Write a protein that binds this ligand. Structure first.
Ligand code: HEM
Ligand code: HEM
Ligand SMILES: Cc1cc(N)nc(CCc2cc(CCCN(C)C)cc(C(F)(F)F)c2)c1
Ligand SMILES: Cc1cc(N)nc(CCc2cc(CCCN(C)C)cc(C(F)(F)F)c2)c1
Ligand SMILES: C[C@H](O)[C@H](O)[C@H]1CNc2nc(N)[nH]c(=O)c2N1
Ligand SMILES: C[C@H](O)[C@H](O)[C@H]1CNc2nc(N)[nH]c(=O)c2N1
Ligand SMILES: OC[C@@H](O)[C@@H](O)[C@H](O)[C@H](O)CO
Ligand SMILES: [Cl-]
Ligand SMILES: [Cl-]
Ligand SMILES: [Zn+2]
Lengths: 410, 411
């Protein structure tokens, strides 16, 4: 009940007490661990006040005014507001606290040493998709900051009775289109083929190129979603070159500088914010390992290997591994050269271990999903590989939610 | 209760029912996942259900469930238990048991091979010298002049827990580690404690970087005894790189036979505390962990230096670059010396096929993602994208404490 975690490379042991405050489920039982499973109607008013209370309690605890009249007054105020309006509204201060802590609690995020330095954009006054478009252009411009990226989140109005949901239909604010071929092949990004179909079917006219920035598909107040094009001058992109291989440029690869997740749900004190796009800056391997070399993605390993003239007849030459490294060198090299913020997996995991130790000391723990935290290459030469982690769900949180097109009453 | 797993690279979905036969605990609860935690005597009461379950499984597999042979065997074991408080496995049951412990080993990626296990029955062994003889024969057989063969040797089961057979080595073949007065380590840092014990027990240490450790063997709960594996039985491979001629001058070698000897084999409630088993290496075990862990030989920087990599910034990925070259050399060296080895691409691919087959014929395949995914190049192997369910089936291999922590010394 007072759990120990050990680092097997440093012999450092941390004691976790924070997990006792966990409230959501893991998917695991005493008989079966689901640690590697990717994905293991509004609330009633009686469901809502304990959630509100738990949140307000930790909020007022965090500002050293637990059990203060100010604390009790707020509980009173929210209590009556729920009883009366069947929901409640967060103070700006609570909204910001809740958002920062939802990031703080994201057990799958390696970048959380930055959690307290999050720019929060309150878009709760937004009423239309054009409004959403404006807020999102501003977010993108702020976060991008000419390459010196800054973490941000924009929060649109909370769910009411699920008839009026605000949703950003795209999974990231910035992503490349994916197209069909008669070839049976896939031009561009295969991950986005379905969303690209909906765009076109909703009226998008695609350039059908390999790296076309998708349009935003925005849903306000439960209305039908609308298409908008992000001003191209707001989308910072990086051409990919290698510091030693001249021919790398000829592959014609590029990627965008701003990782901005837009399909998740932010839960704070029982309230649900279904449209809450957030962004930070890339770890190199996200692009170079996953985006470029996953077989279900741009899958560029074989082509890079050929140009390196590696031995591709047997797998034991480790040509895949060799090309993998060179591709990831090029990504880091490119971003760095264009002064666009990026972190390599060694630095990021090093930072996360420092963050863990900080969290264990000042908070009593740090929920962490080893399967997601360990980088997709060179795993055991990063310190996180040898770090035992405990995974559990704290609120406020970011949650997954159904893709809008499967849900939307058209 | 059915359970689905999905492969996110291929969209293949499999359904698990085997998890219903799960006995032991995971360490997890609905409130906390302990999937990345490395480590999370029996009375007559608990033993016959465990025996009956095993025997039911055994007789099902040979298609004799409910037969007179089945019923007689249960009666026979029941009597033997009530009479003697334990029982003895038939040869066929021991073999079945040991193969299925491997088959159930959720942290093992090499399980496609589980049905081809040579089982050596050493349950008639009584002394340390006897143990040494059995283990020499295991080593010779498994090694097979480089054409490695999977094998396990099974020593007598626990009785009252005061007469345990134990191999004190964590692996049958492993290199010594010596902590120097200046804090540096000569040889393998992972074996410094066991090396010190061996030295205390009278081993004359050569004190070099690759000294094969002596066997430290405990029979029948007596104090352990030192034996030197005959050098001619210990197959080793000089590590060379196919393009880098300076690599041989690093002076690296490794042994060919991976043989785990510190685990406990459980079969039908019986505990076999000495049960060394061996297969062949996946390259990354040596090339990534053994050579490149910071807490092991830790050669990344010297390799990287000799490669003249840009080492002033980690974002040059000089560490990753050198890691690949080292693992190429390990594979190159074993293959050119005709010593069985498998690369992590081949092995993980075979595991996926095995796992799928296991779902179809067995209703599942318990698997620990954290351990199954290789320590380098994770997502370019197919196991990275495979959802896995982890649960515990018996027969099984279990962890047990290091014997020097529990042993009552006779003198
Ligand atoms: C600032 C630098 C950041 C870095 C380096 C970073 C890094 C990462 C990485 C590598 C992943 C794994 C995703 C994958 O492989 O699919 C991830 C996931 C995640 N991150 Fe962070 N992140 C950063 C900022 C943020 C911010 C600002 C937030 C929220 C405000 C956030 C919340 C999350 C969440 C909820 C996940 C899980 C996503 C999912 O399950 O699909 N991160 N992050
Ligand atoms: C024949 C080729 C084999 C290969 C390529 C192979 C591969 C591996 C690898 C790479 C690991 C991970 C160990 C680590 O990184 O710490 C492992 C673990 C394991 N293997 Fe296999 N193995 C093989 C044979 C066997 C055999 C013959 C047995 C038993 C009869 C076995 C049972 C196990 C067990 C119980 C573990 C987990 C051990 C622990 O947690 O310390 N394996 N195997
Ligand atoms: C805010 C932020 C910063 C940062 N560096 N990375 C992220 C995660 C972005 C990301 C998303 C996704 C899609 C997630 C879909 N889930 C619902 C399964 C994939 C990847 C990648 F590339 F695979 F690593 C990266 C988010
Ligand atoms: C039989 C067998 C074959 C094979 N190829 N590999 C193995 C595992 C050998 C191995 C052991 C161990 C000791 C693990 C400690 N546990 C008690 C937690 C480590 C490693 C390595 F190198 F880290 F991968 C490899 C066993
Ligand atoms: C803490 C973590 O579980 C530990 O470092 C594990 C991670 N995965 C592993 N995977 C393998 N194959 N071998 C290991 O020793 C480990 N160590
Ligand atoms: C099936 C398995 O859970 C899946 O491949 C996970 C593994 N770890 C991951 N880790 C990160 N960072 N991102 C991912 O998408 C995944 N995918
Ligand atoms: O030096 C002693 C170690 O080899 C030993 O404690 C092992 O780590 C242990 O047997 C676990 O494998
Ligand atoms: Cl991405
Ligand atoms: Cl090893
Ligand atoms: Zn679990």
């Amino acid at each position: 009940r007072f759990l120990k975690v050990k680092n097997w490379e440093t012999d450092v042991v941390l004691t976790d007490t924070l997990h006792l405050k966990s409230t959501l489920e893991t998917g695991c039982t005493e008989h079966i661990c689901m640690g590697s499973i990717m994905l293991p109607d509004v609330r009633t008013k009686d469901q809502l006040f304990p959630l509100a209370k738990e949140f307000l309690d930790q909020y007022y605890s965090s500002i050293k005014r637990f059990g203060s009249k100010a604390h009790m007054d707020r509980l009173e105020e929210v209590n009556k507001e729920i009883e009366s309006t069947s929901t409640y509204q967060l103070k700006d201060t609570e909204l910001i606290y809740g958002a920062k802590h939802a990031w703080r609690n994201a057990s799958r995020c390696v970048g959380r040493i930055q959690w307290s330095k999050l720019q929060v954009f309150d878009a709760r006054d937004c009423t239309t998709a054009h409004g959403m478009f404006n807020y999102i252009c501003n977010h993108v411009k702020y976060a991008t900051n000419k390459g010196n990226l800054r973490s941000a989140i924009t929060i649109f109005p909370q769910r009411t009775d699920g008839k009026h949901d605000f949703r950003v239909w795209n999974s990231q604010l910035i992503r490349y289109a994916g197209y069909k071929q008669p070839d049976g092949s896939t031009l561009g990004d295969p991950a986005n083929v379905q969303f690209t179909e909906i765009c076109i079917q909703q009226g998008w006219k695609a350039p059908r190129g390999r790296f076309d920035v998708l349009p935003l598909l925005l849903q306000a107040n439960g209305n039908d979603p609308e298409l908008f094009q992000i001003p191209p001058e707001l989308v910072l992109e990086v051409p990919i070159r290698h510091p030693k291989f001249d021919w790398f440029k000829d592959l014609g690869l590029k990627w965008y500088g701003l990782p901005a997740v837009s399909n998740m749900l932010l839960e704070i004190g029982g309230l649900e914010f279904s449209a809450c796009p957030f962004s930070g800056w890339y770890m190199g391997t996200e692009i170079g390992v996953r985006d470029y070399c996953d077989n279900s993605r741009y899958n560029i390993l074989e082509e890079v290997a050929k140009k390196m003239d590696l031995d591709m007849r047997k797998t034991s030459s480790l040509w895949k591994d060799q090309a993998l490294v060179e591709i990831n060198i090029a990504v880091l090299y490119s971003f760095q050269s264009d002064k666009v913020t990026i972190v390599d997996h060694h630095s990021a995991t090093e930072s996360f271990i420092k963050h863990m130790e900080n969290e264990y000391r000042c908070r009593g723990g740090c929920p962490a999903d080893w399967v997601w935290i360990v980088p997709p290459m060179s795993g055991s030469i990063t310190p996180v590989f040898h770090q035992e982690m405990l995974n559990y769900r704290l609120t406020p949180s970011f949650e997954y939610q159904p893709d809008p097109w499967n849900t939307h009453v058209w």
